[PDB]
Symmetry: C3
Subunit: 256 residues, 3 copies
């Protein structure tokens, strides 16, 4: 009946909205802030400084807000947005504040059982990290990306918007927006046309993206050559600009 | 010491046989039925509608009977047989009743630490799912199959009786009965002759199965041509019929 | 306030040093011995016969000292040294005493989330097992080895001192000291020069080891031929002797 179970431990410094639910044997640690409509299951460990937004769901056996591995006492933070689902056994680490490297998760994400979000990672909105996906640290996952079960992501990799990885992919380089990748080591296969159609992209945009993939991957061009050729299409289609920008911001080279 | 620990939470609608043991801080949810001689460890989450048979053992940090990912309020079920061992951290999801697709586990299975059994999967008898094996959903695992640690199985795949996967195999196609598969992506290597000898298969049946593997994999035959060539041997040896039948029922093609 | 939380369960046969901390809902099982300065987190399961040394930290949802898979009642043990960190969800199994095959962990090790240490495994000092690394059983990990996230190790493998595995590596053979291995199946790539520099190895020692790698992997020599050509260098440099000794004691062959 009581929203906060009497068997839960709520640190005196934690700040909760009035309707937050916390299950039995859960720990809401010092410096944890939890927003309206959030439901914390039983057996959850929350550590701070962490901000959890509204209408989130965190399942049993999760450890959210764990320590970042420059100096002792350096402020760190984890920020989670709204309408996220964090399934059982998920581990999420905090990130450093002063260098703008906090760990941050946006809205409407689904982080499935035993997934791992390493320190300083940034997840956008509407992403899906399937069971046991592991982000080593400093990984950027843009909107609508889907990482299938047991995908591994090397530190500093960028996962483009609407990209997709096959199960067991081992990502060591950047994944451009819309690109589908598979295997260990991951290799580019195609584009996520299915995702584009579900998102309501025009047939013209999809056609421009199919041509864009060919320019980058099938016409023997260098990254510099491909970027120069994409400028025109990118200026005309915002979806092609999303693709072009992801190749431009690749620091680890692109997955091929 | 009381069989049902006073620190566990037992829903009034749960039905436990008189000798059932439940450890501290476990939750036995509504519509969970537990049979004679079953031992639930501490820190277990059981959710229903779920039926657990006799003489099972469920270890700590497991979540058994989690929600399946057509309509709101559709009755779903999980059925577990007898003499099974579900180790720490295992996750098992329920499945839909209406279409006869509930999640089902038979008898004498060993489901090792952090293994995942996705919605609508069906496991037979005497199977071994090693640490972190993950069945995406709608997977059928036939009797005596052994999936080595960290094996990944794509949705709708069928794992044949007495088959074997090496550690870290990523299975995207059906695995015929007796076949040994390895790697990411999985590739067929041989037959599990060691398993046949442990089961007491005759020298004649083993010989016929060795010839059958060659018909399918080493003589350039198409699946259709292979199935016709095995017809005679399958009528004479029930074990060859198991192999032929697994290739016949392969909807995603066979692992090569 | 109290060092042993009143919500923890301490078996009457367990032996703890006076200053041991045990968090809420943790179970310190029968025949568990815990040394000075060790901190057991909440939701931890410790099973014995197990010895845990001094200044260790064991995190939530870990199962340490679980049963090993000759006869019923054969004495089995797990021994952990000092200054180790065992992160969330780690599973560590005991090993047999009679044949001197107990599971042993030395000092200053870091065993990261969901790692698995199988029965009869031996971990030295200053090792790092990254998230979800799994040692099947009977694995020997020598000092300073680093196994990246999701590394899988086959039973009976030896991981040499200062060696390194890339994320998702599937190790089926021995890894010589200082060697870097990657992929599924694992392949030798180079030497851990970064590790050598962190240990303050001389310029001569770092150069003799680079020469040693070439003798074994780049000059078309057989193992017996390579061991002969290393004999002179091993006599002058103790670090080359460590490399030579790991190749000489390889029972499953060397990773190539
Ligand atoms: C074997 C590893 C594994 C383990 C567990 C699950 C799947 C696994 O591999 C398959 C996989 O990752 N996907 C395919 C699949 O299961 N589709 C349903 C991608 C995927 C896409 C979307 C979603 N969800 C969207 N809302 C809820 N879930 C789920 C998965
Ligand atoms: C590194 C991944 C990994 C992680 C954990 C364990 C093994 C792992 O890989 C090895 C593996 O999966 N097997 C080999 C092995 O450990 N044999 C003992 C298959 C196997 C066959 C049978 C059993 N049983 C256990 N109880 C009864 N049967 C266990 C394994
Ligand atoms: C995706 C799998 C994965 C999952 C989780 C983490 C990393 C993962 O892969 C990367 C990886 O395993 N390493 C690279 C890396 O993260 N370096 C910081 C090796 C490594 C080396 C040293 C240490 N630590 C030393 N002291 C404390 N930790 C950590 C990792």
């Amino acid at each position: 009946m009581s929203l906060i179970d009497p068997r839960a431990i709520i640190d005196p410094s934690a700040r909760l909205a009035a309707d937050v639910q916390v299950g039995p044997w859960s720990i809401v640690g010092a410096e944890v802030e939890i927003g309206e409509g959030t439901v914390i299951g039983p057996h959850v460990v929350l550590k701070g400084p962490t901000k959890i937004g509204k209408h989130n769901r965190i399942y049993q056996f999760s450890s959210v807000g764990e320590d970042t591995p420059k100096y002792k006492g350096e402020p760190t933070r984890l920020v989670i947005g709204d309408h996220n689902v964090i399934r059982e056994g998920v581990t999420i680490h905090r990130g450093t504040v002063q260098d703008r490297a906090e760990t941050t998760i946006g809205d409407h994400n689904l982080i499935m059982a035993y997934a791992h979000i390493g320190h300083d990672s940034v997840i956008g909105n509407h992403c899906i990290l399937v069971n046991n996906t592991a982000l080593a640290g400093h990984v950027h996952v843009d909107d609508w990306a889907i990482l299938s079960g047991y995908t591994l992501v090397h530190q500093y990799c960028r996962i483009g918007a609407h990209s997709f990885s096959g199960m067991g992919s081992a990502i060591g380089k950047d994944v451009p927006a819309y690109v589908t990748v598979f295997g260990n080591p991951a290799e580019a296969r195609s584009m996520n046309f299915e995702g584009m159609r579900r998102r309501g992209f025009s047939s013209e945009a999809i056609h421009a993206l199919r041509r864009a993939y060919k320019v980058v991957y099938r016409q023997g061009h260098t990254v510099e050559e491909a970027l120069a050729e994409l400028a025109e299409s990118a200026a005309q289609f915002p979806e092609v600009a999303v693709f072009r920008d992801s190749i431009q911001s690749a620091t680890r080279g692109i997955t091929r």
